[PDB]
Design a protein that fits this description.
Layout: E1 8-10, E2 31-34, H1 38-49, E3 54-57, E4 73-74, H2 84-95, H3 97-101, E5 108-109, E6 112-115, H4 119-135, E7 144-148, H5 149-155, E8 165-169, E9 173-174, H6 177-190, E10 194-196, E11 201-207, E12 210-216, E13 219-222, E14 226-228, H7 234-239, E15 250-257, E16 267-270, E17 274-278, E18 284-286, E19 291-294, H8 297-306, E20 317-320, H9 323-330, E21 349-351, H10 355-368, E22 377-385, E23 394-397, E24 404-408, H11 413-429
Bound molecules: flavin-adenine dinucleotide (FAD) and 2-aminobenzoic acid.
PDB class: hydrolase
Keywords: hydrolase, L-amino acid deaminase, flavoprotein, flavoenzyme, membrane protein
Assembly: monomeric
């Protein structure tokens, strides 16, 4: 029997509140950014630091969706050669972020121990580490190695399973998503970025080959440069402009549990379904790392490209069916700019949490680490991500709409955000990007 519980719902933010910029929308701005998640915020910061006027529009709240809900481990381990620089450099930038902003984002360098199950897992770790070490850029060496024996058991204090070997990303980072993006938004505002919350962008008005303005629910702003960083909504937005983004929604659940004395520090990943990350506030983030695909219209429209991972391949995925299916066929995929858009209905969207998944991981954690028998659930939530089918983000100009740049479709945006924000700013301004964005182009879906 297929599950019936996964559901797309309107919700509230779980992240720190960020006040809207006061007053009327500006009549013009050098750049307008659609979306107040980490991608929109980091892009805005990079552009404002280069002297451009920037206005962010956010339909709900800052970090209301993915950026406020992430497990939020900041890592480079096992990344592809195309993605690795984005993560390596993202981490470099995160390590300088508190200094840059003059505040605490909650970013901490904490280290990540991933126990390895067998020789094949060990071989794969050693091979990645070897290759990553030689290509590590930005004059910063890779700080990832294999550990064992006394050192490993010290890291995994109290572990009931006698783990023998592990990959150790010693400089892995952590940011608490309730804190990070909102703190960055406050900094953006300090350097002159205007941020208007409860303000949906319905569309972009363009003629000849030139953007003239963005149309919001509260009026229009003149500009010839637009960044779409709309998270899971980017596909829908671009569909209204006749451009296809091949992204598919996936539902996730997350929780925080209370810290206890004797718990392992930092970030732990065990192959028996245990994944936790110590937060700056002393609680522990605990991820089931199980994916739920709620069957919708787009499951059929994009199925072929995903199939090597959508219900195929050996990844921990589950199908769900429910109201989403019928609702997905009712969701309009085009709207006039003078009428109510779907964005004004679902301002802070998420998926309902899976309590069974969250209970299961927490139990497994308690068995492996008995000190957590005295820990209790602090908070639980659901979330939606929207990857592409090829494990690469979309950071790209839109050839059909000169002036439009997209920064979206990543499941590693907490890590990538600072780097992708700089890359996006470079694309916007016509500067040679700090990282070659060719692999992240929309051109790769052509033909
Ligand atoms: C459960 C979970 C765990 C994760 N764990 C990790 C991790 O461990 N490490 C890691 O690096 N990454 C992780 N991620 C990924 C990371 O959270 C995302 O990749 C990142 O938050 C994406 O940022 P974004 O700004 O593109 O999207 P979002 O944070 O979703 O922001 C997009 C914003 O745009 C707004 N918006 C959309 N359309 C419009 C419109 N038309 N007008 C106005 N506003 C609009 C939305 O309301 C939203 O706030 C995780 C994600 C999830 C869901
Ligand atoms: N990076 C992610 C993206 C989506 C879901 C889980 C994770 C995770 O790291 O656990």
């Amino acid at each position: 029997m297929v599950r019936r519980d996964g559901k797309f719902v309107e919700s509230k933010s779980r992240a720190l509140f960020v006040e809207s910029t006061e007053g009327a929308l500006p009549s013009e701005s050098d750049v307008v950014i659609i979306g107040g998640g980490i991608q929109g915020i980091m892009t805005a910061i990079n552009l404002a630091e280069r002297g451009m006027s920037v206005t962010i529009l956010e339909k709900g709240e800052v970090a209301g969706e993915q950026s406020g809900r992430a497990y939020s481990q900041i890592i480079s381990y096992q990344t592809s050669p195309e993605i690795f620089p984005l993560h390596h450099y993202g981490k470099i930038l995160w390590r300088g972020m508190n200094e840059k902003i003059g505040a605490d984002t909650s970013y901490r360098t904490q280290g990540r121990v991933e126990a390895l199950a067998d020789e094949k897992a060990l071989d794969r770790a050693q091979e990645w580490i070897k290759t990553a070490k030689e290509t590590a850029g930005f004059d910063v060496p890779l700080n990832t190695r294999i550990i064992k024996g006394e050192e490993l058991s010290n890291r995994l204090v109290g572990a009931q399973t006698p783990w023998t070997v592990a990959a150790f990303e010693e400089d892995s980072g952590s940011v608490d998503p309730e804190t990070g993006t909102p703190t960055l938004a406050r900094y953006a505002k300090q350097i002159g970025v205007k941020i208007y919350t409860h303000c949906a962008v319905r569309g972009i008005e363009t003629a000849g080959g030139k953007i003239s303005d963005v149309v919001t629910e509260k009026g229009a702003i003149r500009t010839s440069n637009v960044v779409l960083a709309g998270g899971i909504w980017s596909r829908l937005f671009m569909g209204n402009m006749g451009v296809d983004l091949p992204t598919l929604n996936v539902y996730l659940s997350q929780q925080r549990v209370s810290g206890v004395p004797g718990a392992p520090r930092g970030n732990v990943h065990l192959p028996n379904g245990i994944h936790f990350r110590e937060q700056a506030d002393g609680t522990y983030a605990v991820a089931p790392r199980i994916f739920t695909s709620s069957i919708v219209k787009d499951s059929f429209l994009l199925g072929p490209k995903f199939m090597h991972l959508l219900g195929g391949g050996e990844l921990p995925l589950e199908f769900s069916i429910g109201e989403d299916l019928f609702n997905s066929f009712k969701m309009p995929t085009s709207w006039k700019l003078d009428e109510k858009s779907p964005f004004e209905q679902y301002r802070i969207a998420t998926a309902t949490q899976n309590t069974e998944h969250l209970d299961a991981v927490f139990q497994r954690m308690k068995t492996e680490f008995p000190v957590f028998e005295k820990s209790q659930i602090v908070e639980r939530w659901g979330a939606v991500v929207s990857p592409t089918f090829d494990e690469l983000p979309i950071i790209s100009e839109v050839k059909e709409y000169p002036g439009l740049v997209i920064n979206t479709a990543t499941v590693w945006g907490m890590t990538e955000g600072p780097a992708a924000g700089e890359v996006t700013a470079d694309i916007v301004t016509g500067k040679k990007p700090v990282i070659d964005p060719t692999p992240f182009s929309l051109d790769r879906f052509k033909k």
